[PDB]
């Protein structure tokens, strides 16, 4: 079995920088890139086959893409600690930025490197024998994280097609903001990927700041703190492909268990054990408590309240020592709480996967060392009100036609913004089209 993930933008490659260390720590693959000769891990013999490639000399080379057109962060990534582990040609380096413009990275500065990136991905995929799908690591509010990712997504379906395309996306915060033009390049990059994405996960910025503030105790955190948590959840989402357990979930099972339609494919993501070592051993992290924690609204990684929506699908991906009795005992009283509202057409509402591997911790990092872990993939109709605010900002700002002269001067047509707005109007309409009882 194999898996290939793609990081686009400095957000994506910084996620890879602060996430792929956990991939190097699940197994014992060194930052140098070899198996240590006297200390061993004991995780079978092919649990590294999916995420790292084996060379007859003995060194291990990963299977990923870090692409960025602006050098200042990918150059740090290569020049940093993992200067030898990463394949040099797998780290695509550009020469100029996008300056929060979708148009440049989609047409003008895009096309002269997308051919080389396609060459790298085609070579890497033809190396693999049992490739299962793709994972996407890119932002929305940036220029090179939106345009280049959108062009890569629109070029992927032409070549391979039916292989699964999973999305891990970064969304603008509702209260605070980084840039000023983020609704534009947001709805410009959700317009073309909608027909290509399969199950688009969602990550907020301030919603994980709340997690790192109140559950984990860090005041004034930075991006790396949340990046480690994102790395933890993406590794737990691929936990059962690499290690063994009672109930197993692979990358072809999330699509069949989360999204019922091609037009509603935007679930939500939550990781339950978010406590540190000071309080991990002062309270008992029972399976009932960590199952109850995922359905609390304060644990959500997207700034929205799910009590105002109807739950559609869930996907438990457990870890470590898990008794299958208490899983059913916790889900049975999950249905007992009437405060969690359910829709009628999904009578089951749950998928459970168990792994026999404990959640590892970066040594001396931020999180604690625990025995149990929950990977919540909550597909719900509460993502619509996270889109109505972006649509409201777009409607408020487009009436004065601000900053459009930046886009139209590089291959854009002014009528394409209306088409993206109508596509998102359909993406908003079909969410209440399934809200009928």
């Amino acid at each position: 079995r194999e898996c290939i993930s793609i990081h686009v933008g400095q957000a994506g490659v910084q996620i890879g920088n602060a996430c792929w260390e956990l991939y190097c720590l699940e197994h014992g693959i060194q930052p140098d890139g070899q198996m240590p000769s006297d200390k061993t891990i004991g995780g079978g013999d092919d649990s590294f086959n999916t995420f790292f490639s084996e060379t007859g000399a003995g060194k291990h080379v990963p299977r990923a893409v870090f692409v960025d057109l602006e050098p200042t962060v990918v150059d740090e990534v290569r020049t940093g600690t993992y200067r030898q582990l990463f394949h040099p040609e797998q780290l695509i380096t550009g020469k100029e930025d996008a300056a929060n413009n979708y148009a440049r990275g989609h047409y003008t500065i895009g096309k002269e490197i997308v051919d080389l990136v396609l060459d790298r991905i085609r070579k890497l995929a033809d190396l693999c024998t049992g490739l299962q799908g793709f994972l996407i690591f890119h932002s929305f509010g940036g220029g090179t994280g939106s345009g280049f990712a959108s062009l890569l997504m629109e070029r992927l379906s032409v070549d391979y097609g039916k292989k699964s395309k999973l999305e891990f996306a970064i969304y603008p915060a509702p209260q605070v903001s980084t840039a000023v033009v983020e609704p534009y390049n947001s709805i410009l990059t959700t317009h073309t990927t909608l027909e290509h994405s399969d199950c688009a996960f969602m990550v907020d910025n301030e919603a994980i700041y709340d997690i790192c503030r109140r559950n984990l105790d860090i005041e004034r955190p930075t991006y790396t703190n949340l990046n480690r948590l994102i790395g933890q959840i993406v590794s737990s989402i691929t936990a059962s492909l690499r290690f063994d357990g009672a109930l197993n979930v692979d990358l072809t099972e999330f699509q069949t268990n989360l999204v019922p339609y091609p037009r509603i494919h935007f679930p939500l993501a939550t990781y339950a054990p978010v406590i540190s070592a000071e309080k991990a051993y002062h309270e008992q992290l029972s399976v009932a408590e960590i199952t109850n924690a995922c359905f609390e609204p304060a644990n959500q990684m997207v700034k929205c309240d799910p009590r105002h929506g109807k739950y559609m699908a869930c996907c438990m991906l457990y870890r470590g020592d898990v008794v299958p009795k208490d899983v059913n005992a916790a889900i049975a009283t999950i249905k007992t709480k009437r405060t969690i509202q359910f829709v009628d057409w999904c009578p089951t509402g749950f998928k459970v996967g168990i792994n026999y591997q404990p959640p590892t911790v970066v040594p001396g990092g931020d999180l604690a060392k625990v025995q149990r872990a929950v990977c919540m993939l909550s597909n719900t109709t509460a993502i619509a009100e996270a889109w109505a605010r972006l649509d409201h900002k777009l409607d408020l700002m487009y009436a004065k036609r601000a900053f459009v002269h930046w886009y139209v001067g590089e291959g854009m047509e002014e009528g394409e913004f209306s088409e993206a707005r109508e596509d998102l109007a359909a993406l908003e309409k079909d969410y209440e089209e399934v809200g009928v009882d």
């Binding site: 000769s37 006297d38 200390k39 061993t40 004991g42 079978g44 013999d45 063994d244 051993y281 025995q371």
Partner: protein, 153 residues
């Protein structure tokens, strides 16, 4: 009784005592001299053994020989009745339990040493080597010195 597991999990999370093993077999008609790699896990006293295929691919590749639970010492036991393998007995319920008070052997690290033969469900496998971490662990914990390699294969 010490039924907590967080002791051996926190302080022994990523310690694996490796042992190189050899299963000689000339008595059977088509048995091969298959060598094995042993992994004792101090986290929960469990034990898994691994296979290394030689050159020219004599057999098929599974990458696992035995899974992640404890090795019985006294051979292959006949399987018990259902409910007999519980760790603690309990009186009649009340969904809760009320436990009893007025009421099995497994291989541990004290038995694995360089020069002994162990019982992996009936097989005559022989411990031959270890890595340097295992040498350090035995040097400190049990004062064992001169971890001489047994010449096999």
């Amino acid at each position: 009784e010490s039924f907590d597991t967080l002791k051996q999990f926190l302080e022994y999370d990523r310690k694996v005592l490796r042992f190189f093993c050899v299963w000689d077999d000339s008595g059977s008609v088509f048995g091969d001299r298959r060598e094995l790699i042993l992994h004792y896990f101090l986290s929960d006293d469990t034990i898994e053994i691994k296979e290394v295929l030689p050159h020219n691919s004599g057999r098929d590749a599974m990458s696992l020989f035995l899974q992640r639970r404890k090795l019985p010492k006294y051979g292959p036991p006949g399987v018990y009745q259902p409910g007999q393998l519980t760790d603690q007995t309990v009186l009649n319920v009340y969904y809760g339990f009320l436990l009893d008070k007025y009421q099995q052997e497994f291989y541990k690290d004290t038995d694995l040493s360089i020069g002994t033969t162990i019982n992996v469900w009936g097989r005559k496998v022989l411990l031959c080597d270890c890595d340097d971490f295992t040498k350090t662990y035995y040097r400190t914990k049990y004062g064992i010195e001169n971890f001489t390699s047994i010449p096999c294969k």
